[PDB]
Amino acid sequence: GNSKSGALSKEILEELQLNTKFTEEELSSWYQSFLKECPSGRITRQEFQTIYSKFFPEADPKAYAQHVFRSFDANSDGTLDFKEYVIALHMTSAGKTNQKLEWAFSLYDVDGNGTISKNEVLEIVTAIFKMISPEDTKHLPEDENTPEKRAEKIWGFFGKKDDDKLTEKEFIEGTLANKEILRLIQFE
Ligand SMILES: *C(=O)CCCCCCCCCCCCC
Ligand SMILES: [Ca+2]
Ligand SMILES: [Ca+2]
């Protein structure tokens, strides 16, 4: 006797501006389908990787799947809600519109220090390697067949010296430069 939404729909669509949601009618039935996986209401971090197994049953994005969590599930919560979930899930795609793209400096900044360093870059770098398949690992330049050998390619592309800490401000431009950059540190 009442129109249901799923505890979320008007708060998210509010984002209609940044990035064009696949379809306002998408995150609608997607809310219940989740309630079925568990009559709960909070997604854990250990089970977060249990999902990536649907869109990538090939490689083992299990190492990079745990990084996308603290990426935005640190908002003083401890659990990922469906609202913030659609944001990240659709961010890894939904094409490239205006603004946005800022959520990227969030997944790469694991610790979250307003600035990225070689360490964090190393973790996400090695993890991303797992997602890559050996059969395809032969395509990338051998000058970086290992996480320790590539850190020089990525960090070398940007070019840090005095302020050896990449900020979220440039993290967006340093990439807007050569469209062939985001291809390396690419994420899915
Ligand atoms: C109020 O009268 C009860 C809630 C009515 C909800 C309307 C939708 C009912 C149909 C749900 C199943 C539809 C499957 C396509
Ligand atoms: Ca959260
Ligand atoms: Ca940091």
Neighbours of 115 (CB within 10 A): 17
Ligand nearest to the CA of 88: 2
Q: How far apart, in whole angstroms, are the C-alpha atoms of residue 11 and residue 13?
A: 6
Angle, alpha carbons 22-63-132 (nearest 5°): 75
Q: What is the CA radius of gyration of the chain?
A: 18
Roughly how many angstroms between the first and final C-alpha of the chain, as a whole number?
Answer: 42
The protein residues having their C-beta less than 5 angstroms from ligand 2 (an ion) are 73, 77, 80
In a domain, 1, yes or no: no
Ligand nearest to the CA of 42: 2
Instruction: Tell me the one-letter amino acid at 147.
Output: P
Tell me whether residue 84 is annotated as binding: yes
Range of the domain at 171: 101-188
**114 alpha carbon to ligand 2 midpoint, in Å?**
19
Q: How far apart, in whole angstroms, are the C-alpha atoms of residue 39 and residue 21?
A: 26
Tell me whether residue 111 is annotated as binding: yes
Closest to 115 measured CA to CA, from 165, 72, 162 = 165
Chosen domain end from 77, 96, 115: 96
Q: How far apart, in whole angstroms, are the C-alpha atoms of residue 131 and residue 56?
A: 9
Ligand nearest to the CA of 29: 1
Number of domains in the chain: 2
Instruction: Tell me the one-letter amino acid at 97.
Output: T
**27 alpha carbon to ligand 2 midpoint, in Å?**
17
* Cβ atoms of residues 152 and 144 within 8 Å: yes
* Cβ atoms of residues 91 and 100 within 8 Å: yes
In a domain, 3, yes or no: no
Chosen domain end from 65, 96, 127: 96
* Cβ atoms of residues 69 and 89 within 8 Å: no
**84 alpha carbon to ligand 2 midpoint, in Å?**
7
Tell me whether residue 19 is annotated as binding: no
Packed helices 147-158 and 118-131: angle between N→C axes, nearest 10 degrees: 120
* Cβ atoms of residues 64 and 88 within 8 Å: no
**4 alpha carbon to ligand 1 midpoint, in Å?**
9
In a domain, 159, yes or no: yes
Residues whose CB falls within 8 Å of the CB of residue 155, separated by 6 or more in sequence, listed in order: 118, 121
Q: How far apart, in whole angstroms, are the C-alpha atoms of residue 68 and residue 106?
A: 8
In a domain, 24, yes or no: yes
Residue 167 bridge partners (DSSP): 115
Closest to 15 measured CA to CA, from 74, 103, 80, 78 = 103
Tell me whether residue 79 is annotated as binding: yes
Instruction: Tell me the one-letter amino acid at 133.
Output: S
Full 3-state SS string of the chain? CCCCCCCCCHHHHHHHCCCCCCCCCHHHHHHHHHHHHCCCCCECCCCCHHHHHHHCCCCCCHHHHCHHHHCCCCCCCCCECHHHHHHHHHHCCCCCCCCCCCCHHHHCCCCCCCEECHHHHHHHHHHHHHHCCHHHHCCCCHHHCCHHHHHHHHHHHHCCCCCCCEECCHHHHHHHCCCCCCCCCCCC
The answer on 71 and 134 residing in a single domain is no
Tell me whether residue 137 is annotated as binding: no
Q: How far apart, in whole angstroms, are the C-alpha atoms of residue 156 and residue 145?
A: 15
* Cβ atoms of residues 158 and 166 within 8 Å: yes
Which pair of tokens denotes residue 108? 């790469």
CATH code, domain with 68: 1.10.238.10
In a domain, 144, yes or no: yes
**64 alpha carbon to ligand 3 midpoint, in Å?**
17
**160 alpha carbon to ligand 2 midpoint, in Å?**
32
